[PDB]
Design an enzyme around this catalytic site. Sequence first.
Site, short mmCIF file in Angstrom:
data_model
loop_
_atom_site.label_atom_id
_atom_site.label_comp_id
_atom_site.label_asym_id
_atom_site.label_seq_id
_atom_site.Cartn_x
_atom_site.Cartn_y
_atom_site.Cartn_z
N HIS A 46 -43.57 -37.58 38.92
CA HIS A 46 -44.72 -36.71 38.69
C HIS A 46 -44.89 -36.27 37.25
CE1 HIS A 46 -42.97 -35.13 42.67
NE2 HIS A 46 -43.93 -35.97 43.00
N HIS A 48 -45.77 -33.04 35.33
CA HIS A 48 -45.80 -31.60 35.50
C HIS A 48 -46.61 -30.96 34.36
CE1 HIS A 48 -42.73 -30.90 38.83
NE2 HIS A 48 -42.77 -32.22 38.69
N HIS A 63 -46.70 -29.47 39.45
CA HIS A 63 -47.38 -30.73 39.21
C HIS A 63 -48.68 -30.45 38.47
CE1 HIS A 63 -45.41 -32.59 43.07
NE2 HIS A 63 -44.53 -32.07 42.24
N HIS A 71 -51.42 -31.63 47.04
CA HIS A 71 -50.49 -32.70 46.73
C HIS A 71 -50.74 -33.93 47.61
CE1 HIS A 71 -46.88 -34.72 45.46
NE2 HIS A 71 -46.53 -34.89 46.72
N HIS A 80 -52.84 -34.34 43.28
CA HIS A 80 -52.76 -33.72 41.98
C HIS A 80 -52.94 -34.84 40.98
CE1 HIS A 80 -49.83 -30.74 44.02
NE2 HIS A 80 -51.07 -30.27 44.06
N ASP A 83 -49.67 -36.70 40.42
CA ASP A 83 -48.98 -37.35 41.54
C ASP A 83 -48.91 -38.86 41.38
OD1 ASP A 83 -50.30 -35.02 44.09
OD2 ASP A 83 -48.60 -34.87 42.74
N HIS A 120 -37.49 -37.31 40.36
CA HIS A 120 -36.81 -36.47 41.33
C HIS A 120 -35.67 -37.12 42.10
CE1 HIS A 120 -39.46 -32.92 41.25
NE2 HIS A 120 -40.31 -33.79 40.73
N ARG A 140 -35.17 -31.87 40.08
CA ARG A 140 -35.68 -32.58 38.92
C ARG A 140 -34.50 -33.18 38.19
NH1 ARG A 140 -40.32 -28.07 37.03
NH2 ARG A 140 -41.19 -27.91 39.15
ZN ZN Z 1 -42.13 -33.26 40.29
ZN ZN Z 2 -48.33 -33.14 43.50
#
Ligand code: ZN
Ligand code: ZN
Lengths: 150, 127
Positions: A46, A48, A63, A71, A80, A83, A120, A140
């Site tokens: 992702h 962020h 995100h 999401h 997002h 994403d 992740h 993370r």
């Molecule tokens: Zn993330």
């Molecule tokens: Zn997301």
Amino acid sequence: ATKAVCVLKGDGPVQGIINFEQKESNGPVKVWGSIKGLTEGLHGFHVHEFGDNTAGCTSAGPHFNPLSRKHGGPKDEERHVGDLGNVTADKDGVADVSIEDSVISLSGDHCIIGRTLVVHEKADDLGKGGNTKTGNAGSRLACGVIGIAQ
Amino acid sequence: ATKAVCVLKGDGPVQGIINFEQKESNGPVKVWGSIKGLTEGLHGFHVHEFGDNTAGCTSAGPHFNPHVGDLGNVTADKDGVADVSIEDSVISLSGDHCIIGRTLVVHEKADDNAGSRLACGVIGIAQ
Ligand SMILES: [Zn+2]
Ligand SMILES: [Zn+2]
Ligand SMILES: [Zn+2]
């Protein structure tokens, strides 16, 4: 062609280099590179909101979500901007990344330059878990700020 | 962006956090923070073109100059700490003099030539 790059680092073995390229401002962004040190299998991936690594990946915020959507996965209408789904690591812990995405951008309001890319611990369920704002991808593991590249 | 931040790190002990704030579009940018692990004295302080740290600070490219990126020097005290408080009207957090996504670098020597790149980081959106 606009280009960007991100070096992912964390407190453990996870590290990688991810490149971005966008040929036209209205076009898709090619995302490619590799991430090492991962457990074999799927890992959430992702962008962020903040390019703030003062507390490692913890300070990157949520995100990136300029459109205030829910999401989802990359091919979902409702997602997002940040994403990017999941990457997959081989038995040596190496995830080869090759994504083409038309929602992120290297210019305009979907702009990810200066934000944080994060990989992740677990798979992102894309909001299709059958029973989220995160996708339940766990911790993370590594991250970096997305910078302008040659 | 109205605020940016950069974490400086390198192969040695030089480390710090530098904040940037530009409350007004095209207005002066306030730059402040602290850097430790430095030899006492003057150290060149520059924005380099690329936010590319794939080869550490060696991949950051040349001084940003579409010098626009020249932020003078920082001064380290006897304890190796440089407190930074600068106002610069040439850099920006938007536009042609955009430094978001570029690299901030602190150098071995003064920028009166600046020598090695002791520490660097990519400048990220903070607010
Ligand atoms: Zn993330
Ligand atoms: Zn997301
Ligand atoms: Zn320099």
